[PDB]
Amino acid sequence: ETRAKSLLQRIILPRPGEPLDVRTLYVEESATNARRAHAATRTSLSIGAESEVSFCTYFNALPASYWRRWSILSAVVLRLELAGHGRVDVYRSKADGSRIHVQGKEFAVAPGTESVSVEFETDLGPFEDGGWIWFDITSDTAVTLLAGGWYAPIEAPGAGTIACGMPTFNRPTDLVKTLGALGSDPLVLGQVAAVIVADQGNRKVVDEPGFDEAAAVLGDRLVIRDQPNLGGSGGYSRVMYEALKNTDAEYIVYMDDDIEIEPDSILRALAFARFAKSPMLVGGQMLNLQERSHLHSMGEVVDRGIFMWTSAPNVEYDHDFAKHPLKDRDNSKLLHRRIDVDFNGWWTCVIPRQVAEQIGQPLPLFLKWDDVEYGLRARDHGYPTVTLPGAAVWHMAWKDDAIDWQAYFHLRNRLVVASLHLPGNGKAMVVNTIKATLKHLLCLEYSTVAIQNLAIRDYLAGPERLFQLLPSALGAVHALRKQYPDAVILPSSTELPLASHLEVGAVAEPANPIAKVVRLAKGVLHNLRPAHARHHETPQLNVPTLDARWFLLSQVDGVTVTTADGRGVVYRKRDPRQALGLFKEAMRLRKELAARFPEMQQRYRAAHPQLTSTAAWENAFGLG
Amino acid sequence: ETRAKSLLQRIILPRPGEPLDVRTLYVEESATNARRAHAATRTSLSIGAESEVSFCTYFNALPASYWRRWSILSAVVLRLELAGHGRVDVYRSKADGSRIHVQGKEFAVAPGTESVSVEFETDLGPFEDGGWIWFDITSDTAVTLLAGGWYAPIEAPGAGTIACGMPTFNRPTDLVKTLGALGSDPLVLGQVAAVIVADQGNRKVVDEPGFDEAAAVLGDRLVIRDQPNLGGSGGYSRVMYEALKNTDAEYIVYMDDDIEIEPDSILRALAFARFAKSPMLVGGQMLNLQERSHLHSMGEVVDRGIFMWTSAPNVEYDHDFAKHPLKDRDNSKLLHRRIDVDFNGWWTCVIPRQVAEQIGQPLPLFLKWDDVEYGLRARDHGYPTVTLPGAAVWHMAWKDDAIDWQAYFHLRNRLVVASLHLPGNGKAMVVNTIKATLKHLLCLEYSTVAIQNLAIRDYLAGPERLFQLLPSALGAVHALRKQYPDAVILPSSTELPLASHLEVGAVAEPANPIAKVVRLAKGVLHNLRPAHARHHETPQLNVPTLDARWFLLSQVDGVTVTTADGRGVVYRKRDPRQALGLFKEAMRLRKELAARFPEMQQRYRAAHPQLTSTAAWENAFGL
Amino acid sequence: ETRAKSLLQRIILPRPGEPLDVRTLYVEESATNARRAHAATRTSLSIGAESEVSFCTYFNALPASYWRRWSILSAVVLRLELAGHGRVDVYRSKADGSRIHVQGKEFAVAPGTESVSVEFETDLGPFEDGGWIWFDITSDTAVTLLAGGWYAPIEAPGAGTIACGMPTFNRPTDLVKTLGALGSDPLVLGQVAAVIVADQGNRKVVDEPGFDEAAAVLGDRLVIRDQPNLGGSGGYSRVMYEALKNTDAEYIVYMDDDIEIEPDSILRALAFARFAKSPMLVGGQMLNLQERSHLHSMGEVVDRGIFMWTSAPNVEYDHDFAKHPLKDRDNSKLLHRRIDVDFNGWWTCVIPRQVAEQIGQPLPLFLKWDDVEYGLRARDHGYPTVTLPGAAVWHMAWKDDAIDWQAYFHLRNRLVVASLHLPGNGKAMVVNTIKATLKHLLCLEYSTVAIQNLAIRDYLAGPERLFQLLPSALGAVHALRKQYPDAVILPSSTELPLASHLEVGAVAEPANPIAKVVRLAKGVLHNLRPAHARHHETPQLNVPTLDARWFLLSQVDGVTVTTADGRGVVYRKRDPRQALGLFKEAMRLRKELAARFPEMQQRYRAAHPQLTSTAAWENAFGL
Numbered sequence A: 001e002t003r004a005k006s007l008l009q010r011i012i013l014p015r016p017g018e019p020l021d022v023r024t025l026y027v028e029e030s031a032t033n034a035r036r037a038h039a040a041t042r043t044s045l046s047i048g049a050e051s052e053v054s055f056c057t058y059f060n061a062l063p064a065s066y067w068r069r070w071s072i073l074s075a076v077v078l079r080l081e082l083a084g085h086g087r088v089d090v091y092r093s094k095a096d097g098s099r100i101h102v103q104g105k106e107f108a109v110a111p112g113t114e115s116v117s118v119e120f121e122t123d124l125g126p127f128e129d130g131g132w133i134w135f136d137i138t139s140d141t142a143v144t145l146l147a148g149g150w151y152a153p154i155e156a157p158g159a160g161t162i163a164c165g166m167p168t169f170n171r172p173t174d175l176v177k178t179l180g181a182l183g184s185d186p187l188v189l190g191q192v193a194a195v196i197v198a199d200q201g202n203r204k205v206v207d208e209p210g211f212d213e214a215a216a217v218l219g220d221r222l223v224i225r226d227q228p229n230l231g232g233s234g235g236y237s238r239v240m241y242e243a244l245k246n247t248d249a250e251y252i253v254y255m256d257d258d259i260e261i262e263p264d265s266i267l268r269a270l271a272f273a274r275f276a277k278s279p280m281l282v283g284g285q286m287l288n289l290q291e292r293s294h295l296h297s298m299g300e301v302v303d304r305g306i307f308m309w310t311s312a313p314n315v316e317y318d319h320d321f322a323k324h325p326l327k328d329r330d331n332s333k334l335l336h337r338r339i340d341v342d343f344n345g346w347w348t349c350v351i352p353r354q355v356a357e358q359i360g361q362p363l364p365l366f367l368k369w370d371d372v373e374y375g376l377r378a379r380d381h382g383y384p385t386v387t388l389p390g391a392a393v394w395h396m397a398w399k400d401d402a403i404d405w406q407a408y409f410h411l412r413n414r415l416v417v418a419s420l421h422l423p424g425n426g427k428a429m430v431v432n433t434i435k436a437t438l439k440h441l442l443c444l445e446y447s448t449v450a451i452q453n454l455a456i457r458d459y460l461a462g463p464e465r466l467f468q469l470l471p472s473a474l475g476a477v478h479a480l481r482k483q484y485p486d487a488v489i490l491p492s493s494t495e496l497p498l499a500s501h502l503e504v505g506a507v508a509e510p511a512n513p514i515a516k517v518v519r520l521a522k523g524v525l526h527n528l529r530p531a532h533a534r535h536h537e538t539p540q541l542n543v544p545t546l547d548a549r550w551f552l553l554s555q556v557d558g559v560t561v562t563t564a565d566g567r568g569v570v571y572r573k574r575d576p577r578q579a580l581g582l583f584k585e586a587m588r589l590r591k592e593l594a595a596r597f598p599e600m601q602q603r604y605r606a607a608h609p610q611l612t613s614t615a616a617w618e619n620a621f622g623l624g
Numbered sequence B, C: 001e002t003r004a005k006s007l008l009q010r011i012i013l014p015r016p017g018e019p020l021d022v023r024t025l026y027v028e029e030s031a032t033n034a035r036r037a038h039a040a041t042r043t044s045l046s047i048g049a050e051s052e053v054s055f056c057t058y059f060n061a062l063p064a065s066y067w068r069r070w071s072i073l074s075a076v077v078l079r080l081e082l083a084g085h086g087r088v089d090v091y092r093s094k095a096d097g098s099r100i101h102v103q104g105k106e107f108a109v110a111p112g113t114e115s116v117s118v119e120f121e122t123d124l125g126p127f128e129d130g131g132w133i134w135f136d137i138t139s140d141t142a143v144t145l146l147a148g149g150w151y152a153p154i155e156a157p158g159a160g161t162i163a164c165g166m167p168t169f170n171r172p173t174d175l176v177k178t179l180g181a182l183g184s185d186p187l188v189l190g191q192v193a194a195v196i197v198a199d200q201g202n203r204k205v206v207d208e209p210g211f212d213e214a215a216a217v218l219g220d221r222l223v224i225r226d227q228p229n230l231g232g233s234g235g236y237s238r239v240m241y242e243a244l245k246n247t248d249a250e251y252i253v254y255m256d257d258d259i260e261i262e263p264d265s266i267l268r269a270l271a272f273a274r275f276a277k278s279p280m281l282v283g284g285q286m287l288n289l290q291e292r293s294h295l296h297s298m299g300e301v302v303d304r305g306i307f308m309w310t311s312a313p314n315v316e317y318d319h320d321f322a323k324h325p326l327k328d329r330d331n332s333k334l335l336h337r338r339i340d341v342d343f344n345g346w347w348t349c350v351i352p353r354q355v356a357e358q359i360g361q362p363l364p365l366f367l368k369w370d371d372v373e374y375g376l377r378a379r380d381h382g383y384p385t386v387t388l389p390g391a392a393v394w395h396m397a398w399k400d401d402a403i404d405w406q407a408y409f410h411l412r413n414r415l416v417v418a419s420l421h422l423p424g425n426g427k428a429m430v431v432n433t434i435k436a437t438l439k440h441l442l443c444l445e446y447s448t449v450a451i452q453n454l455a456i457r458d459y460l461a462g463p464e465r466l467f468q469l470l471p472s473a474l475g476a477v478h479a480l481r482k483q484y485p486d487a488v489i490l491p492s493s494t495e496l497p498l499a500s501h502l503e504v505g506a507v508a509e510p511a512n513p514i515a516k517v518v519r520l521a522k523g524v525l526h527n528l529r530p531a532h533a534r535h536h537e538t539p540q541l542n543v544p545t546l547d548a549r550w551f552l553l554s555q556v557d558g559v560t561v562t563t564a565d566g567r568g569v570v571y572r573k574r575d576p577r578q579a580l581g582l583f584k585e586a587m588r589l590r591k592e593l594a595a596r597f598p599e600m601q602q603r604y605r606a607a608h609p610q611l612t613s614t615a616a617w618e619n620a621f622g623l
């Protein structure tokens, strides 16, 4: 007689010996409890007498606003199996984090039996701008939650079969763990029709220890394809090609090879994609793999002025649930607002087969902006994208991605997608790139300016080169970078002579803004003077990563800057002649870009159907 | 199968009944734990079920940046012996204290066995500017850590034999405690080849109760010598002399006679010196003996402008770990930066035998600026000094060391080392000493100005007088100070008449700098008028230590000031004639110093091999 | 073998079921302890395994500064008896609250025996400006402190016999409870030779239930004497007379009939009075009876410029140890300084027999300014007064003591004592009383000025009327006050018609000081116009106690003000002619006082020996 029909989200609990900071993602235990809640299994919990455990957490709370805005559901059904005497209280929240009591039931096991069912049904009405639904358990005796989860009162449409896919490149140790975690949960395995791997490196995962057991667990689902290193674009395009050609799944699940999979997130994203009103992309969120209690972002959009991907409104990066729980209205109010996004990353993303077969294959961009363009294309075809809170995987956050080789792909493809979606003349984007070049030159980052000029040149060459540059651009970018001293990395600062500290002045951040202006003037005047070769062989300062800002780099001639991860240093040397030459070349290229932008818009929008075609990608993979 | 090859740092735990604030130096227990962790032994811990214990502490976290910058080690190995069912998560940090989860494991004891081994291996890659490596234990059941420690994956070079040495002076009880603690650890005794003591006081340690048991535990290693009071310089010089002459050890371990020795710190410094790329000095840090949970300084450098020793960059004094643990990124982020130092104190310092035989013996400076000069000499000879975190010893911190007799030895030697490592004319140092003399004369500290003039006069006498002033300057400084009223310490303010509180106005510090300037003007105008003798007999105020600042001593004629430790008072009296005369004499001496500084530089750089030779110190030891 | 000789202070512990906030005066348990410490008796504690208990509390910490400044002791001996396995750590503090570790010992009961002795001896050296000495107990297993206390390493001078004395007036229940508490401790009764009571009321203590048992416990020490109500002055004078005539005790102990006695405080004050360098008055502190975890004052002095009793330097009233313990360096630093006082209250005060026989009897002042004058006379006769921390009793603090009848005795006796100890012409005191009269007239407190004028008149009547006004001033003040509407208390504001709120403007406290000035101007202008009789029958506002300030009372014609304890209201009314006449009379009397001040000084200083004679008080007692 239960209203529960289809499972949407299980009540998952931490692992044996889980760190205390990560436990906040599952349960919010009250400090007044004289005993910590012991998690016997991954779906059961054991709390002692006179204890209160709140499930207003990132994993066990239901985002009712998302299930109201995009799902065909009118109400949700909470079901719990309990043993012992206690009470379960169901609360909801508004768009500003205010707690509202919904219902409450005092439960106890009937004598003669062993367990008791507690069931609530709450409408998705008051969640127009945001809000969650959660439940707290306040025990009178020793209470044990045997099982629980959220349900939809109607059966799930379709079959729900999914084809997973991960592009890998010389990361077999992590791919083995990913496949094992994918095959560990039988509920997830029951929905997987294929597991597609695109090995683009030389160290094949087949030759990795621990691979055969996970492969036997997955059975015939595992399909590994070898191909040249075509980057993330080529890898995910091969995944989608295999899923659309050789598997009969209803949803393609883009994943990454270096993620820690929470298996219930896949089921949550699948159930959300199945109950959607219209076909839509359902992506997952990212938790920091190094700080596992941190949610990296609630959602991402793209500023259409300068055309640049940024955080969605009411979103702040890096949220620590251990320090600021979901109940904290001071620091976690923005988490109670429904976040509307333009795109979602491919670390975990669900694409319906209809959307994939209609809008086509990814663009041959190798890396960067390959997911933003796909999200924008899906939106233009009438398919929105939702970053579903609760469904997430663990992956490393973002370092020197705007300085190293990536600074090439970040710019070129930025100009490509802008050719396909930026409305207007694009002068604001050119001014943004001009000031970015100014900053790069003032910070003694000349290889970045060189490779960005190369990116502008390769972009102005037309879309007909996009498939030729797919496997050969990275080599040229690397060869151009390694000819500048600021790109060659050393083991440590000891490989150079000791810091002389000669001719060093004020290099600390200014306080008042007039000091900022006078230091900018000082830095301009200093960069105008010819440098001293003395500081090109013996560095002046050993500057860390965070101390390497403009107010320090604009007053030096030669400085060792420590890399982001702290594994080495790079010797940046100031050269007025080369700086002026790179600036002149960048301004020439940007003027030509501002002049030819309508032509490039037309050409890229005309070549887009040929770039997303299946035959062109078949020729790219070598299946001619 | 284990990658462990050389023990570098043992996981040590607090003593039975250890104070809670001191326990934070070893373990960081979570407040949500229902039961406090019980340390059965000093090398094992027992935690209850569903508890978490973090080892990101001052004694159980490896300073990976130091073992990357100066050691030949490419990686470290963490080996743990555990009983029960739980999980061990090894983390690291960056230069700003960002916690990076490195690697986790879940352990359980198989049925039929008594314990399990948990081993990790982590490279020393991402530690260019700083960072630690630690591990946390989250228990599912009752979990007992039987043993654990850090291990280098290669064997240790050499033999690891050490010769420890402590100069003592009328402190036999603390020396007996130190000798007992030195021979308490078997792993430490296994590496000690000699224990040299230089008794310079009348109260001999051989006549102290409890000495014979510690002597029998140490064995033939204990070697006690007797010599006149030649200060710390002479004591450590005698220690190094005996070590290089009669012992075949590979390292000399300078220690102090009044320290509480953490035994594993000696082995940590030894392992850090043995795995060094080039020979180097591996000094230890100093924990406050009175506040046993505080670390005094991460390291010390010397500013070459005014030439003065101070805290290294990114170093603040007095860091309480009980209040600000290592995990606190708000108040402990500076402890995650690799601190480069110029020298290290001789409360615990490791000097390789090669370095000692090459650079020589300490200078005959008696007290102050001896370890600084020795570190700078080692640096000039191609040997750096590193203050290794985690390897520390308890000892008192610093009070009146800028007013009492030490103000002599601190200034004179400050000039001596300035004749050796100060590039330039040295006018900045002279201006700094001029303004310091101004501060002293405004604070009615005339004895300090007098002994500083005496220090300048003795420094301008040349290096030939150094060995003559080694056993004779202290008595002269005492006889000079006992002629001033501000240098005579009374038992209490009760020995003087009651405070009159007459003619006492603005003595509380103001809040605006304009008022600071007008009060400085008031004090300048007050130090010009002839003082009233009535206030030189009956004091005006009974001022405590903290209240004795310039905004009070410049508006008074006679005041009793309480000493730093609070065991007495001193009667400071203002005299315009004597103040002006001392100022004139100090200015004349500093003019002569600024004029003759190149001459003194040449004289001290030429006579350096003679003052650091074995024969001169043998003549000084009475040998 | 033990250096302990004389018991100075026992380590006392809370009562069964003691409130948590009161437990902070005895023990400071660590919040991390899994179990709260249980005190099976008042002298034993039982702490569980892995727990820390700090005795740096108000009762179990030794004020080393006071035992160094006023006592002949050179050190203090801490002796404890412990069962179990743990560690004791003795700490001290400086004058600013910095914790300095002194010593530490690990204890464990030897096999066969049941308890072990732990003994420390610490010199009273570094306590010139302040500081305490305490000990912390950190357990390993179950630990039980059976008994402990502080000791002097020399025997106590004299016998230590004390004669107690408590004046009472119609308080039989509290006096019986006080007698029971005084007789409950055998260590206190062993020193008590007499318990003197001066029953000055109609209801006698002899007819109170529960009196016979306390009387039988006290034995023949209880000496009750009946006499007319002569106030506190007469009661304490009769107590001193009886103690000096009919008992052979060494120290008189003034107590109050309505205090909750901590019995060990008496022994602490006695030990401090015996070991003193010179004879001195060792008084005790006052803990708030309504907030038992609060200390009212660390000490009291008297400002000589305007001659008014106030808090001593570095003394803040009302210190809550439950919220701000002694270890809190931010909110309890001032408690770590030695407080020098001018006098001490008579709720608990030890006066040596020599001092009492020499300086004489208290002055016949009825109430107020008697203990101040006695302390000043003692100080003039070379006998200082010291308020000893740790030795305290519980008693009510202070309300309306500046508006009711007490405003009379406080002013008159303020002048009298001034005539004995005020250097100069005393114009500042007259100006202070003038501005106080201005404030009283602004707040519609006309009876206060009406009785202050009577006080100025009776003071100018000469000291020959002091013994005549002893049993007659209270009735005159009462009959004069009850003729004013602001002094007649009503059961509630419901006795008057409801508040009309008519002609009520700005009554909230101004923000910027310019608003304060303009509101003072408005209030001055409002007191110039004729008052409307309408507001004299129906009140305008029902103003609480804390809201009855000048900024509200200076802009009204008739207001009900609630009394301090909240048991009634008074209908204050404004009358411009009456206020003007009271002001004129006050100015006349104050100009006459400022003119005749040297005359009254000479007269009172000449009459003081006759007013403190035994014959005059024998005449006053009816003997």
Ligand SMILES: [Mg+2]
Pocket (backbone or CB within 6 Å): A256, A257, A258
């Ligand atoms: Mg990846």
Ligand SMILES: [Mg+2]
Pocket (backbone or CB within 6 Å): B256, B257, B258
């Ligand atoms: Mg020392």
Ligand SMILES: [Mg+2]
Pocket (backbone or CB within 6 Å): C256, C257, C258
């Ligand atoms: Mg009373």
